[PDB]
Amino acid sequence: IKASTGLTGLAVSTNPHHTLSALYGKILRAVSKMPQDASYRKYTEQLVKQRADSVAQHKDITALEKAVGCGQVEELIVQAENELILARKMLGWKPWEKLVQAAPAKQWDWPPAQIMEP
Amino acid sequence: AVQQVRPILSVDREEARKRALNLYKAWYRQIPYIVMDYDIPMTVEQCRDKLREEFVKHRNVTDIRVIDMLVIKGQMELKESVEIWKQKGHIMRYWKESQDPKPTDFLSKFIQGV
Amino acid sequence: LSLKLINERVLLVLKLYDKIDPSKLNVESHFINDLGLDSLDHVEVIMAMEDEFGFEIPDSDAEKLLKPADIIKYVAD
Amino acid sequence: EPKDIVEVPKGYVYVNNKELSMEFADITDRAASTMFFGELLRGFAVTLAHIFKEPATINYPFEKGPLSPRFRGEHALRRYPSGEERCIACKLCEAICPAQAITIEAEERADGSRRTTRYDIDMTKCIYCGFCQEACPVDAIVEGPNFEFSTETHEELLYNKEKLLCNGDKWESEIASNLQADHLYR
Amino acid sequence: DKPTVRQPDAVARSHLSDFGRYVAECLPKYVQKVQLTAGDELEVLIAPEGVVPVLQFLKDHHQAQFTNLVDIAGVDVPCRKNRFEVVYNLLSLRYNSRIRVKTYTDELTPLDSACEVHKAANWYEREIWDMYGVFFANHPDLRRILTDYGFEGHPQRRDFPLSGYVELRYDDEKKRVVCEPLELAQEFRKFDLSAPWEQFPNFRNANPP
Numbered sequence: 001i002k003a004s005t006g007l008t009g010l011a012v013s014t015n016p017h018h019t020l021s022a023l024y025g026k027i028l029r030a031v032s033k034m035p036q037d038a039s040y041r042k043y044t045e046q047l048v049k050q051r052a053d054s055v056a057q058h059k060d061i062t063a064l065e066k067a068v069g070c071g072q073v074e075e076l077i078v079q080a081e082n083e084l085i086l087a088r089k090m091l092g093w094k095p096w097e098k099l100v101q102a103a104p105a106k107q108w109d110w111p112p113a114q115i116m117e118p
Numbered sequence: 119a120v121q122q123v124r125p126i127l128s129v130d131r132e133e134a135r136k137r138a139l140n141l142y143k144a145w146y147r148q149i150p151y152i153v154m155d156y157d158i159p160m161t162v163e164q165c166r167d168k169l170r171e172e173f174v175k176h177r178n179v180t181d182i183r184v185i186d187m188l189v190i191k192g193q194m195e196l197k198e199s200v201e202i203w204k205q206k207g208h209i210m211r212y213w214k215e216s217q218d219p220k221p222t223d224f225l226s227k228f229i230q231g232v
Numbered sequence: 233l234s235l236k237l238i239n240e241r242v243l244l245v246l247k248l249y250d251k252i253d254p255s256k257l258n259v260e261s262h263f264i265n266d267l268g269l270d271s272l273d274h275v276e277v278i279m280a281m282e283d284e285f286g287f288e289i290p291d292s293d294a295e296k297l298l299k300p301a302d303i304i305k306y307v308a309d
Numbered sequence: 310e311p312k313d314i315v316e317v318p319k320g321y322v323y324v325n326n327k328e329l330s331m332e333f334a335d336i337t338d339r340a341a342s343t344m345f346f347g348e349l350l351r352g353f354a355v356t357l358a359h360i361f362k363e364p365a366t367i368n369y370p371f372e373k374g375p376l377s378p379r380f381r382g383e384h385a386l387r388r389y390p391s392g393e394e395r396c397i398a399c400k401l402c403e404a405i406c407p408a409q410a411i412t413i414e415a416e417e418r419a420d421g422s423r424r425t426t427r428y429d430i431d432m433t434k435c436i437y438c439g440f441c442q443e444a445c446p447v448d449a450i451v452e453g454p455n456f457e458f459s460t461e462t463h464e465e466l467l468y469n470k471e472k473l474l475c476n477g478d479k480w481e482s483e484i485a486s487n488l489q490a491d492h493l494y495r
Numbered sequence: 496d497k498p499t500v501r502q503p504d505a506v507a508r509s510h511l512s513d514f515g516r517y518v519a520e521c522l523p524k525y526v527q528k529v530q531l532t533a534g535d536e537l538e539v540l541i542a543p544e545g546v547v548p549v550l551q552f553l554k555d556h557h558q559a560q561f562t563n564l565v566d567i568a569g570v571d572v573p574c575r576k577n578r579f580e581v582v583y584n585l586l587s588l589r590y591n592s593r594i595r596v597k598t599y600t601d602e603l604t605p606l607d608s609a610c611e612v613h614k615a616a617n618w619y620e621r622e623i624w625d626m627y628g629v630f631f632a633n634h635p636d637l638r639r640i641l642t643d644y645g646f647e648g649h650p651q652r653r654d655f656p657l658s659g660y661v662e663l664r665y666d667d668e669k670k671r672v673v674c675e676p677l678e679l680a681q682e683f684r685k686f687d688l689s690a691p692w693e694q695f696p697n698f699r700n701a702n703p704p
């Protein structure tokens with residue numbers, strides 16, 4: 001077993017597969033509640049399922065690390081947890097809807113303060 | 119000529135007064151402490167008098183939002199005087215005692231230059 | 233109860249107050265317009281009561297009170 | 310050497326991966342170090358030793374220096390080899406001066422030549438950046454090498470053209486040397 | 496064959512470009528526009544309400560994972576009805592890329608706070624509040640940072656004189672330092688450095704209404 005995570009605070013965590021699996025399940029359900037025509041949904045399943053499908057083939061934690069890339073398991077679980085909070089907040093945010101506000105004319109125009117031909 | 123816009127704190131003019139008068143409470147209650155803490159000439163009655171005039175400084179504020187900000191400034195300055203971050207110079211600033219009231223009637227202006 | 237104490241203390245505030253008209257200073261004297269005191273005067277007056285009674289009053293009391301009798305009601309409270 | 314504690318790839322060096330051994334010779338070493346302050350003794354003897362190095366204090370103002378030919382110090386308005394003022398009031402020096410410490414007013418001398426009347430520098434606003442001399446098209450103004458120009462009164466620092474010309478006259482030889490050193494190189 | 500002219504990282508332009516469309520189609524309600532500035536950085540123009548959702552989306556989602564919030568740069572531009580613009584320039588260590596989020600607001604309406612998203616921002620909101628007066632809603636403590644105590648006005652605005660309105664000295668009558676109306680030994684001499692000849696045609700009609 002690796003002695004240290006190389007980072008302060010980030011401690012070595014056992015049963016990573018169980019934790020990663022459990023995290024992937026919850027986020028999948030969290031996106032399950034989403035509407036079926038949300039781009040955020042469309043991609044999270046394929047990404048998460050790709051991860052949650054890679055979780056199994058590599059019993060060795062180091063083997064899984066290489067297979068999944070993207071960093072070490074210790075951070076990787078945190079990545080998953082972050083996204084759990086994202087989905088719960090995302091459902092609460094309803095960002096799949098259309099534009100709340102149209103920018104006023106000449107808002108995002110650079111350079112500023114130049115007369116124009118109508 | 120109305121606009122349907124976000125709030126800041128106060129949703130109605132009466133809430134605005136409620137907030138504005140809350141500030142007036144903190145400032146009135148604070149004055150004695152500053153008279154003690156800050157070794158400056160000013161006395162309680164004068165400090166109280168200035169506090170009155172300095173609210174009167176802007177009586178005809180109308181917008182709910184503008185009056186909200188004025189209170190936001192006051193709550194800040196309250197805390198800066200409540201705790202002693204400020205300095206005797208900073209607190210006296212409200213009196214402007216370095217410059218004599220400049221001439222105002224036309225001749226005194228005329229005879230003293232633009 | 234203690235209605236002498238409440239009335240006595242309440243009266244002495246406005247009795248011994250600047251910015252005020254002694255006559256017409258009824259217990260039914262509306263601070264705002266009957267008494268001619270500004271709202272700011274009104275705020276400082278209720279505070280002087282918080283001085284003479286050492287009592288934490290809510291801001292909602294401000295409108296719920298109008299008259300020295302009103303604060304007498306809130307003082308014997 | 311003790312083994313590491315985190316395996317390191319290249320492009321990095323962990324400065325604490327070395328393990329604190331538990332071998333008896335290793336613990337007794339550390340214990341003896343604490344019981345008799347060996348590490349302090351090493352540092353102690355270092356400072357004793359380093360008395361025996363000669364101090365590097367320059368005996369100022371007798372001994373002094375070194376500087377380099379590009380040193381940016383007192384300002385000076387140079388003059389041609391004939392003695393004529395080099396400045397022509399092109400006013401670039403003012404236009405570039407980051408601190409806006411330069412003020413110029415020029416007219417025609419009776420000969421009809423384009424020359425300054427007032428030429429002022431405030432060395433309480435100048436930053437001795439040297440943008441003025443890098444810009445001047447005739448090397449009229451230069452950051453002369455003098456740097457001991459210290460005054461008891463603030464007013465004495467605001468140089469006008471008369472003061473600047475005097476410095477140019479005073480320092481002309483040295484300024485000539487530097488420019489001969491750097492003109493083809495600057 | 497132009498050694499003077501640099502050549503950007505094209506593949507970096509590729510990734511940022513496709514990723515930018517990803518963000519636009521994942522946050523439809525908020526992202527108003529996504530553009531790729533020629534300096535290879537990526538800008539994300541949002542409406543004022545989506546500030547936190549965009550930041551929260553970025554820091555959290557796998558593909559973004561933009562954890563560090565470098566700064567909150569404030570920009571002032573009169574002639575834009577709600578002028579005060581804000582810039583949230585973020586970094587992503589996981590993918591080694593930078594992103595910029597931008598929003599607008601006027602001198603009156605408040606603005607969302609990033610204190611609840613990145614703890615790093617806390618001081619920055621205090622800084623913009625001091626320097627422009629852009630309020631921040633839900634900010635824990637909006638105390639001024641830089642300007643001195645009892646300073647009136649927010650100097651970084653472009654409708655504020657460079658030298659300020661007042662300046663300090665010391666009184667002997669009062670053994671104290673007093674602020675006085677401005678008085679300058681030499682009035683700051685501007686220079687009118689305006690180009691008469693348009694030196695850039697490419698930006699002339701491009702970006703028109």
Ligand code: SF4
Pocket residue numbers: 395396397398399400401402403413444445446447448449450
């Ligand atoms: S740049 Fe040189 S020549 Fe031009 S005004 Fe300045 S000192 Fe004179």
Ligand code: SF4
Pocket residue numbers: 402405406407408409410411430434435436437438439440441442
């Ligand atoms: S050295 Fe720099 S700051 Fe000083 S006068 Fe020359 S250009 Fe101005």
